[PDB]
Symmetry: D2
Subunit: 247 residues, 4 copies
C-alpha cells in the first residue's frame, strides 16, 4: 500500500499501543523493527515477528531497554543495517509512575526522564542521520502533557510535555528535508498500563466528552495517518486522540 | 469504502479546499451535498455534481449565501430530505478580509462574523437535530486563529479563534451521542483565495517549517480521516495542517 | 500612583468585576470613565462617580448598551471629550447565556456575539486612533474560552475564544506604537452572575486546583498589573486567573 | 511591603534575570537566599548580599551547581535553616545550548536536562515539605517552550516545555495548601546570555510585536506580581512576558 518499500522503527512494539502500531504499519506495507525490554515479553515479541513474516513483511524484534541510551541507539543502528534506513520512527515505549509528590524518588525521576524523554531523543538522533527525505517522526505523548487534571501526575506530566518542545524543534530542524515530526496524545486507552476496568476507570470516564475508554487501534490509526501520504504536510503538531478529555 | 452509506454536507464545496473535500469524501463513498454562493460558480458546481454521479455517488449542489442564516438552514434542510440525515458536516466556506485596523468597516465585521462564525453555527444547529449517533462535525479554521504572526489580520483571526470554543463546546454537547467535533487549521494552501505565486507568498514560505505551500488534498485528507472510522475517538481537537507554521 | 495622568475606559464598570477594576485603577491614579446598561444601575454608577471624585479622581459614568454598537462608539467618544485620549481600555461588560444546544435561539446568538465580541472590537476601534503610545488594551475573556469542560456553554465559549485571535491580531496591529493587548481569563469568581453559593457552585469547585471561588479583586489586580509599568512588555498573552481550572 | 516577613529562594540569583528578581523581591520586603555556580561569581554574589543587607533585608548567597541534585537540595535545606521555610521559590538558573541537531552531545543533553528540569524539580521537592500555606512556586521557562520558531533549539525547547507539565501537575499537587505554581516565559531579554546587541538580535526583534528586546525588570515585575497578594488566585498558568513573540 502507501507504506510499501518503507522501513518503520517502533519502540515498545511488543504490546498495547505499540503492538497495535506495528500491526497497522505492517498492514500498510512497511517493513517493521520494534523493541521490547521485559524478559516476559520475549515470547510475545517473537510471535509478533512470526505473524508479520507470515503476511510477507520483513520484521525484527530487538531487545533494548529504553532506560539505557546506548541500547536504544544500538537497536536503531541494527535496524538500519538489517532493513535499511528508517522512513518512519515511532517513539511509543513509555512508563507511568504516579503518586504523592513527596514520595517521588530520584530513581522515579531518572527512570521516567530516560525512558520517556531521552530515549526518544536518542532514537531520533540515530535515525535522522540517514532518514530519507519525506520521513516521519511520531512521538507518543499523553493528554496529561497538556492538562494534568488531578494530583499525583507531576513527574509523568513533565516528561510528556518535554516532547512538545522537542517535536516543535524537530519540525524546524528537519523540515528542509521534508521530514515531519508530530506528537500524538492518547486519552485513556484500554491497555495493561491503563485497564478500562480499573477501580479508577470510572471517575476518569466521567470527565471525557465521549463516555468510554478508547482502544489501541485509535492510536494506531492516527499514527498510520501521520506516517502515510496524507500526513505529508502535517508537522510540528500535537494531535489529541483523547475522547474529548481536553475539550 | 469507509464512508459507504453516509451522507456528507459541505459549505463552499464548489472550489478550492471545499471542492477537494467533496471529491475526497465521495471517493471514500459518501453521498454529498454542498453549497456555493456566486452565480458564476453555478456551472462549476453542477459539473462537480455530475462528476460524482458519474462515479456512482448521489450529490446535490445548493446555492446558499453563508451570510444569510435562513439560506444555510434551508440548505441543510433540503439535503436532509433529498439525501437523508447528515453524518458528516463540514463547515468550510469562509471569507478573508484583511487590512489596517483603522480601515475596518462594520460591513467587513458583520460579513466576516456572519460567514466565518454564524454560518457554521447555523449549519450545525440544523444538522445536529437528526445527525445519527457517531456523526462527525468538522470546522475549517486557520493557522491565523492560533497565531496572527503579522499585522492586518485581527478581524479574521477573531472570527477563526471563535471556532475554537465553539468546537470544544460542541464536543461536550454531542459526545454522549458519539458525535465528534473538531477544527482543522490550514496553513498556506495553494487556492484562488491564496495563490502559491502571490507576491507575498515568498515571505510566508519563509516562516514555515516545510518550505512550500500545501495543497487542497492535504486539507481533504485530514478531513477524510476525521470523517471516517479512525476519527471515532478524536473530538474537541485542533488539528494543524500548516507545514509547521506554528512549530 | 503608577497610573497618574492616565485615563481609563471600562465597559460595565458599575458592578462586579468591572466595579472592582474601576476602583483599583482609580486608586492607582487613573481618571476613569465607565459604562452601565441598566437604568436600574444609574444610582450605583453615579454613586461610584461620587466615591471617586471624593478621592480626587476625575470620573464619568456613561450609559451605553453593549448590544448596540453605536452606543459603545459614542461612549468612548464622550469619554475622550471629557477626559482626553484613553490610555487604558478595559473591555469587561459581558453576557453569559448557557443551556442545551438545541434551545439556542438566534436572539441568543446575536446578543451574545454583539455583547461579547463586537462591542469590544468597536470600543478598541474608537479608542485606538488617538491612544497614546504605550497604551493598554485588556479584554476580559473566560476560562471557558480555553476549555469548555462541560455541556451547555458552546455559544458562550465561542464568543470568548473569539477574543484570543482578536487580541493576538491587535498586539501585532498596535505593537509598533508600544500599545499592548492582552486577554484575562477569570476562573469562577464570586459575583452576581456567578454566585459562590449557587446550587451548581459546588461541582465547579471540585475541579479547581485551589478549592474555592476567586474574588473580584483577583481580576482587578491582574488588570492593574497589565495597565501599569510592569505590563509594558506583556502583549498578545492569555492570562488565566482561574484558580487552576485549566491546570 | 507585601512580602514582609516572607522568605524567597532564587536559583541563579547573581546576575541577569535572577539578580533583578532578587533585588525586586527584596525591595518588596522578602528575606532572600539565592544560588550561583561559578567561582568567578562569588564576588558579585556577596556584593549583592551586602546591597540587600544595607537595605535592611536578610540575605544569603550559596554556591550550588544546579547540575548536581545534592547541591540544589543542600542549598534549599541551608536556606530553610538560615532564613526559615521558603514562601517564594523561584527556579531561574538555566542553560541554553543551541546548534544543529546532529551535533548535540551526551553532555549537552545531560547538562541541559539536569539544569533546566531536574534542578527545579529537586528544589521544589525540598522546599515544598515545609512551604507555608499560601506559598508560591515560579519557574522561569522560555518563549521557545511554546514556539521554537527556528531550527537549532530542539534540546532547549524540550527542556523548557518540560516545565509546562511540571507546573500544571504541581498546581494540582499543592493547591489544597493554597500554594500556586506558575511558569513565566521570557521573550528576548537584554542580558549576558542574550545580549541586546548580538548579531542575531535584529532578526529576532523583527519577529516581535514590540520591536525591541525586553529588560530584566520586565521579568522581575511579573515574578513579583506572582509572589504577592495579587497572585493568590493564579496557579497552573503560563504567563508570557515576550514582547508578543508568540502573537
Ligand atoms: N494507555 C494510556 O492510557 C496512555 C498511554 N500513553 C503513552 O502511550 C505509550 C504506551 O501506551 P501503553 O500501550 O498503554 O503502555 P503498556 O504499558 O500497555 O505497553 C508498554 C510497552 O512499552 C514497552 N516499554 C516500557 N518500558 C520500556 C523500556 N524501558 N524499554 C523498552 N520498551 C519499554 C513495553 O515493552 P515490554 O512488553 O517488553 O514491557 C510494552 O511493549 C507510553 O508512552 C504511554 O506513556 C499516553 C497517555 C495515556
Ligand atoms: N487557503 C488558505 O491558505 C487558508 C484557508 N483557510 C480557510 O480554509 C477555507 C477555504 O479556504 P479557500 O479554499 O482558500 O477559499 P476559496 O475562496 O478558494 O473558496 C471559497 C469557497 O467558499 C464559498 N463561499 C464563500 N463565501 C460564501 C458564502 N457567503 N456562502 C456560500 N459559499 C461561500 C465559494 O463559493 P463560490 O465558488 O460560489 O464563491 C467557494 O466555493 C476557509 O474557511 C478559509 O478561511 C484558513 C487559513 C488559510
Ligand atoms: N463571573 C465569572 O465567574 C466569570 C466571568 N467572566 C466574564 O467577566 C465579565 C464580567 O463578569 P461579572 O462581572 O461576573 O458579570 P456581572 O453581571 O456580575 O457584572 C456585569 C457588569 O457588566 C455590565 N454589563 C453586562 N451586560 C452589559 C451590556 N450588554 N452592556 C453594557 N454593560 C453590561 C453590568 O452593568 P449594569 O450594572 O449596568 O448591568 C455590570 O456592571 C463578563 O465579560 C463575563 O463574561 C468570565 C468567566 C467566568
Ligand atoms: N534571557 C533570555 O533571553 C531568556 C532567558 N530565559 C531563561 O531565563 C533564565 C535566566 O535567563 P538569563 O538571565 O539570560 O541567564 P544568565 O546566563 O544571564 O544568568 C545565569 C544565572 O544562572 C546561574 N547558573 C547557571 N548555571 C548554573 C548552575 N549549573 N548552577 C547554579 N546556578 C547556575 C548563574 O550563576 P553564575 O553567576 O554563577 O554563572 C547566573 O546567576 C534562564 O532559565 C533562561 O534560560 C528564557 C527565555 C529567554
Amino acid at each position: 500500500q502507501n507504506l510499501n518499500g518503507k522501513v518503520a522503527f517502533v519502540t515498545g512494539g511488543s504490546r498495547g499501543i505499540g503492538a497495535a502500531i506495528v500491526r497497522r504499519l505492517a498492514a500498510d506495507g512497511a517493513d517493521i523493527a520494534f523493541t521490547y525490554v521485559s524478559a516476559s515479553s520475549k515470547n510475545v515479541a517473537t510471535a509478533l515477528v512470526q505473524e508479520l513474516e507470515a503476511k510477507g513483511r520483513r520484521a525484527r524484534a530487538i531487545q533494548a531497554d529504553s532506560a539505557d541510551p546506548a541500547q536504544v541507539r544500538q537497536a536503531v543502528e541494527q535496524a538500519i543495517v538489517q532493513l535499511g534506513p528508517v522512513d518512519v520512527l515511532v517513539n511509543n515505549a513509555g512508563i507511568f509512575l504516579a503518586g504523592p509528590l513527596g514520595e517521588v524518588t530520584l530513581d522515579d525521576y531518572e527512570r521516567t526522564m530516560n525512558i520517556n524523554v531521552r530515549a526518544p531523543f536518542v532514537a531520533i538522533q540515530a535515525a535522522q542521520a540517514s532518514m530519507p527525505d519525506g520521513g516521519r517522526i511520531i512521538n507518543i505523548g499523553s493528554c496529561l502533557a497538556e492538562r494534568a487534571g488531578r494530583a499525583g501526575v507531576t513527574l509523568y506530566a513533565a516528561s510528556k510535555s518535554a516532547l512538545l518542545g522537542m517535536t516543535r524543534g524537530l519540525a524546524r530542524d528537519l523540515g528542509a528535508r521534508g521530514i515531519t515530526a508530530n506528537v500524538v496524545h492518547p486519552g485513556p486507552i484500554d491497555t495493561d498500563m491503563n485497564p478500562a476496568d480499573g477501580e479508577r476507570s470510572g471517575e476518569l470516564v466521567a470527565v471525557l466528552s465521549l463516555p468510554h475508554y478508547g482502544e489501541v487501534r485509535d492510536i494506531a490509526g492516527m499514527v498510520a495517518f501521520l506516517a502515510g501520504p496524507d500526513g505529508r504536510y502535517v508537522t510540528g503538531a500535537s494531535l489529541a486522540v483523547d475522547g474529548g478529555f481536553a475539550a
